[PDB]
């Protein structure tokens, strides 16, 4: 009958990209992982030790433990009507950091700086981001671009 294995329905998930086959490059064995760091899970089928399950591919989680050649991550899984903390240990080859938080961190490093600037400057500066507000007035010249009149084109002789 039907099968529900640990690696079922994984033909395309755990295969390597085009012309990225073979050994894992070294920059990932030299990256450093501390507790609290935020990591996105992407596995590779070159390394069957420490693999995650196909649910946790593409998810994002928080480190909670650091061991030789492997780190533990916490992930919130939906089952039924609640979320569950899933603690899973992975080798590093299936792990890359998350730049999502790093962008926020440098935004903080900037807002602190310009707050420090504006305080001594005696001015107030808005640090809350804003969406794409509507556009504003403007005046469009007609010097080199006269309005080029168009028309709907016909069908005959196009076919």
């Amino acid at each position: 009958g039907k099968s529900h294995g640990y690696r079922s329905r994984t033909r395309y998930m755990f295969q390597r990209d085009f012309r990225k086959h073979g050994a894992v490059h070294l920059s990932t064995y030299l990256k450093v992982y501390k507790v609290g760091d935020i990591v996105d899970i992407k596995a590779n089928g070159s390394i069957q030790k420490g693999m995650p399950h196909k649910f946790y591919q593409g998810k994002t989680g928080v480190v909670y433990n650091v061991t030789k050649s492997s780190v533990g991550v916490i992930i919130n899984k939906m089952v039924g009507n609640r979320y569950l903390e899933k603690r899973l240990n992975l080798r590093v080859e299936h792990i890359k950091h998350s730049k999502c938080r790093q962008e926020f961190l440098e935004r903080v490093k900037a807002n602190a700086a310009k707050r420090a600037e504006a305080k001594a400057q005696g001015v107030a500066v808005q640090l809350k981001r804003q969406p794409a507000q509507p556009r504003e007035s403007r005046i469009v010249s007609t010097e080199g671009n006269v309005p080029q009149t168009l028309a709907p084109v016909p069908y005959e002789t196009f076919i």
């Binding site: 650091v66 533990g72 919130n76 039924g80 009507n81 609640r82 979320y83």
Partner: protein
Amino acid sequence: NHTAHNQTRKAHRNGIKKPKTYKYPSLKGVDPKFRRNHKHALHGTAKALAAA
């Protein structure tokens, strides 16, 4: 037979709530070598902040 109709409406009546993260999580799943030393570190910090 294995019709998922109404199951998500059932899930979404009492919401789907997050697991209430706390400060100081549990130290059961961590490296015991780390844990053993953490105990001693904190005990010494206590015996130092008690003296000062």
